[PDB]
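Researcher: Please generate the 3D structure of the following complex. Treat every line as part of one assembly.
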Amino acid sequence: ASEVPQVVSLDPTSIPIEYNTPIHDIKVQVYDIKGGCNVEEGLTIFLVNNPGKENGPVKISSKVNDKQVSEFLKDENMEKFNVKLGTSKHFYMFNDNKNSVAVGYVGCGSVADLSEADMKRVVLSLVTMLHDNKLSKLTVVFEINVDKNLFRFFLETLFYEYMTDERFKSNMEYIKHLGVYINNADTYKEEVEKARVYYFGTYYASQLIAAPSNYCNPVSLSNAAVELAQKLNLEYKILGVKELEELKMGAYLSVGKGSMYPNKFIHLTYKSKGDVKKKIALVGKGITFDSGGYNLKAAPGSMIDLMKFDMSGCAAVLGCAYCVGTLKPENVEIHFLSAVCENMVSKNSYRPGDIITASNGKTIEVGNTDAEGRLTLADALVYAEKLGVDYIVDIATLTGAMLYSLGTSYAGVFGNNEELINKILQSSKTSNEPVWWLPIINEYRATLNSKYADINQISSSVKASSIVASLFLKEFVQNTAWAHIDIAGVSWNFKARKPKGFGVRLLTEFVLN
Amino acid sequence: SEVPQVVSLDPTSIPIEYNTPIHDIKVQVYDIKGGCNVEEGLTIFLVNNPGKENGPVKISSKVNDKQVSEFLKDENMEKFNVKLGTSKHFYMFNDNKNSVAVGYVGCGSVADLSEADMKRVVLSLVTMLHDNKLSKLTVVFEINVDKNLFRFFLETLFYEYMTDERFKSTDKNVNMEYIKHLGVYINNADTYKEEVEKARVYYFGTYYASQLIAAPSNYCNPVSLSNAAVELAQKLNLEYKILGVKELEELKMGAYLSVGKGSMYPNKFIHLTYKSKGDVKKKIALVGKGITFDSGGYNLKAAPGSMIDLMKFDMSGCAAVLGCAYCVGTLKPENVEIHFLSAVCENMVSKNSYRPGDIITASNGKTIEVGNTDAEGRLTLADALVYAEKLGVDYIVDIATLTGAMLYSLGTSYAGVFGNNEELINKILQSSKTSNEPVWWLPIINEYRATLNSKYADINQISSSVKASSIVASLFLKEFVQNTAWAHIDIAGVSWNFKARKPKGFGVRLLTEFVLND
Amino acid sequence: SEVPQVVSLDPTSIPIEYNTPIHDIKVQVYDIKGGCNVEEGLTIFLVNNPGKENGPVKISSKVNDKQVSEFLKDENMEKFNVKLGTSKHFYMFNDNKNSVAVGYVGCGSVADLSEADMKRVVLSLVTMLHDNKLSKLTVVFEINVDKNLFRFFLETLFYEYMTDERFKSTDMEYIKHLGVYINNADTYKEEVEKARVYYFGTYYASQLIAAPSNYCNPVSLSNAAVELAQKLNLEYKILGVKELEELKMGAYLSVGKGSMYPNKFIHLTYKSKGDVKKKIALVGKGITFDSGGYNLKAAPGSMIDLMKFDMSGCAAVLGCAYCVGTLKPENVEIHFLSAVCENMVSKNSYRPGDIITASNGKTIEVGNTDAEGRLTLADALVYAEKLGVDYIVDIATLTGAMLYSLGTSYAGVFGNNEELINKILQSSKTSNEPVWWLPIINEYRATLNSKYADINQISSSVKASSIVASLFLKEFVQNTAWAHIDIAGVSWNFKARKPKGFGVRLLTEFVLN
Ligand SMILES: CC(C)(C)C(=O)N[C@@H](C(=O)NO)c1ccc(-c2cc(F)c(F)c(F)c2)cc1
Ligand SMILES: CC(C)(C)C(=O)N[C@@H](C(=O)NO)c1ccc(-c2cc(F)c(F)c(F)c2)cc1
Ligand SMILES: CC(C)(C)C(=O)N[C@@H](C(=O)NO)c1ccc(-c2cc(F)c(F)c(F)c2)cc1
Ligand SMILES: [Zn+2]
Ligand SMILES: [Zn+2]
Ligand SMILES: [Zn+2]
Ligand SMILES: [Zn+2]
Ligand SMILES: [Zn+2]
Ligand SMILES: [Zn+2]
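Model: Done. Output below.
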């Protein structure tokens, strides 16, 4: 660990992290729905739809072993409510044994197959009830059709949205039990503890992102990665400035010049006990705060107050490290990499127009100091290819233009290898973290031709900045299958005012399958 | 039919050139194994060097002239290299003691030239045709191209060679002269021969669309554009129908009509039809956005970078569809019925204009809340799409300069395609490949549909405020196709060639290939 | 003179090319009478057609090669036209069966070419040189140029031909001979080696300007100026912060407060060997990077990435120092001055509103930290006048408004003395570096009346910024002929993405004549 510098003694010197969450204490049981439902304790919620009849009435089919609840659930009562996606109702009542129970439903629409976005709305409705609930148990009865991956997604999302981050603070009570009624329960049981792992990986990423830039800086973040590595028995190595200078990472070092925090390059490694048959490098953009540099984020809508999230790529990679270190896949070697620094305004900062030299010898003309992500990634990519891996995948809050292309739901993936892109797309499908394949259009490459340097950092005209940024990155991968995931648009949940932890499950599914 | 005028100097028709100098070029194709005759004009060798970047020039073709062959020997040609786009001129006397001009264009070190690579080659060749009064060009192929690429070479050569001087008066090019003969030497020539006149057909459809787009909004208005479409239909003996305002009112096209309310030109709905003789296997509706000028309306294009002076381009989709109509009407495909549609109007600022906040009713009965008058294109398309589905077709493909956000997603080279049907989308991509007009599949993300939920109307026209506009606009259009395979091509970013300051006529070849191979 | 570094990869000197391939070109000038020989390389005829716009090409010169004469016959050349900048060139065998290239550049239909026309002609010529491997270029003048325009042709040819590759790393063959056919060749021969000197003075200035702000800083620029002085046997003196504090240069020192590089005042001196009959101070604005300071260049179109060019005035002066030091004019004493610093954002920077005191005791109210040029020039001008000189001429990238007045071609000249101004205009005509006289309007002076300080730095309303800035500078020259050349609009060739080196030949012609 390294000592993080302070301006005043009241400046924090570590990131507060919660490992043991109330979610981990929840005992989960899955029952088959064919046998009927037991309603004796806590809150019971039926997931109900009505195919064909848009906003049609609620109808409960499951038999329950309680006379009081059976009467409440009768068709004449339930038809007073409708299945409009996200709509919920729940009532408190006494059961046959005169114990207080709560019974309700969440509408799941009129389409039999729920998208991940549909399922998310269902969960949010459920969580709203939970945040006003003090009962010890929740039972969810699936009277809809979900596959194994979507059911795991249901649990992951439920766990993630339920949990509230109160680290920076100075009603309800977390349930101790979760019951689930679903068809062929036995096949869904193995998803439960996988969901719990995917949850924390995602929530851990969220904690790092949500942590403000005075708490989460290059030194405190690399410190956290070390502590994580030690807990998971991963090989770890933090490269300091002197080492970085020796490796000649001029692009990455240039970005951090104006920061009071020294650059820290995070390198964690998972190695399988058995034969190593595939080597992967995961690269996360790790800007702990993006002020923009001398190209300061002062334009309307530039949202400088959001830019603690510019290390979301790093967070996703570290979150994946947790999942991989916990699930311990076989026959694989994975490197978790992040060139961490802070982009600030100072007498010491790099300037627009500056020509800097990357670790592969390429000279780069800086057109915009706020395009700093690709500079750090450039040296990180050179570092990764030197490891001699089969796949290189980077993930980064790289370009604001993603907001105008795919939006806030789908991340974009670019690459030099169709097979690798396909694996990512497949991983997106099974993780239910949506990604869309975007092209690297070679005709735009000429725009990066610098008059004085080997290459330009940005275009002056093209405006297709996400593609141009990909073209720049491609110049630092010489002979390895490489993919690039731009999560600038999808990383932050603007409506809920919190991170998503996007990427963790996607990257984990990628290495596992 | 009568174009309204403000003053007598206002034009009442779009000047259109049908018989171009390109059509006067006699094209001959010879097989390269017979040897090349170098007699006159300019003879250009298309040469590459596989694996050797900036490799030396070597003329592998048999040249049927002792003097020219001597000139083109490897020893003499070594000094020149094949760097993609590079070119050289040679001057010499042939065996008949006549002075002849010879040269080459470098095609690089790749074995397969891409879309952009070949256009680079053609542009280099065109520079050799400009500022040189030549009567004949001979092109010798020493690179390998498939039939579609050979056709693409000719189409692009014709299109770039052609110079549009319709609006020139005192500044016509005094030295403008076109070759009268084109010679082509290539391996297995008989295979490529049929591609020649197809290329000339593809050239004009593209150039015709280009003429309509380039034509300024005072020349090209809803009345004169619909008048041009009738003249085209009459020339091709296609069925044609133009729907006037009273007919449009009967069909209750409130979305389309509201957009044109502020204009001095009455709305004109174009409906051309190609009908194959015999069994019709496929019925297709092609829909083009036909905004002759987009001021933005009361949401005026006044913001920095909004490029209001470009907005004559906003009927590029309609132009593409009409260009396709020329190609289809000329090549006469079998087993198909094609409907060429465009809801044409002008988006202007007036006492009569539609307002931000207005609730209008589309022809399928859905009420629409206008949040931005500058999103007028999807409004006209909405009624056009409803009209299209009433025709009972198998495929509906619309093409439109719809969202500026395409510049930020795919840029100026690739068009975006959206749709409700994977098979149709795949056919569009296939047509993209064979036409060499690049298109990329983009998603219609259903999670964003909620943002189009209106407090008062059935649906919001736009925004508040997803930012992924191209997708939101596609979601809106989807609401007006109920049960028909539909695809949407946003060409807002690729329609105009900013570098050359001219239209591309994008989509004509794409749509034609779609029709011809479906 | 030790350049401070943030990281070990930060450059500590400006790379400079002194020996260029241009200097290895052997120039021969022949009279057009007696005919032209075409034996090898590329031969280009400069042709116009006064009778017809875009008229046919017609070669008038007798060529002593029959094969080439056949090529140049009227029937062949009339297929080509003389539109300015249009060119064609063909490869062929001459009488000796040696490969030669012969062509032309269109020179339009106006008998007398302007400097803008001639530059277009040269650019067409250079395109051919860059695209052909040639040991020799021959140019045949079938147009009319005077001695100054001919030199300009050579200077421009040399400058545009030369390619700056100092910052190229890892992402050939110049001509060795130049032949010129022209009527009355003997009167043009003496322009050749003068042109070569003017070329490098201009190219040397270009090298300094093009060099990014991380390479070119106040310390390395002053170091570079010393190296130049040593090679030319000029007296030199670099004033450091202690000395500047002693000289009370508060305006100059305030600007550099926020930089990591100490202020460095450059003072080079050329003195003729004989009696000194004229003393001249040339003053160049030397801002190595202009971020704008706390008035950050953040507005759209402010082009902060261009701002390495803000020492262009200094570079022109140093480039002039090369030419003067090489050509060694008689009975003159020339001082080359530049108050070099960097305008940055820091805890240490000067603020908007700060009241500072120039070396002549005048207190100045800073209204805008991005108007820093006039503040550095203020102390530089006071320094210059104390040298007891006859003329003071400053050259500076001072005001962006120049783009709106004269544009990108003509610099503006302001002054307090009509004789000096007319001399500069005369030097503009002979150097072919276009300048236009603009007024110092005394009615605007009242806008600089500060409420608290002696004077305002900027006007709060009078949008005539170039004139207002001239009024400010005028306050720091008390009793000396002074002129001010604003090159903010002309210094950078935006189309070619490179500096012009504007001002070197202008200032040198001023000293020489
Ligand atoms: C426009 C340039 C090329 C400067 C760019 O993409 N900059 C990105 C950047 O700063 N990289 O280090 C960038 C990244 C994200 C965002 C962004 C801004 C918002 F207001 C958002 F809500 C968001 F999700 C992303 C904007 C610019
Ligand atoms: C921002 C909204 C959603 C209103 C939009 O996309 N409007 C488009 C429109 O006016 N439809 O009728 C629109 C279409 C094209 C462009 C556009 C602007 C430019 F400066 C270009 F260079 C260009 F190619 C397209 C901008 C907005
Ligand atoms: C508007 C003020 C008075 C602050 C001003 O002229 N500032 C100049 C300055 O920064 N002095 O230190 C200034 C100088 C040059 C430019 C300038 C900007 C561009 F984008 C150009 F392309 C250019 F040629 C000059 C703009 C402002
Ligand atoms: Zn940034
Ligand atoms: Zn960033
Ligand atoms: Zn519009
Ligand atoms: Zn429009
Ligand atoms: Zn400034
Ligand atoms: Zn300045």
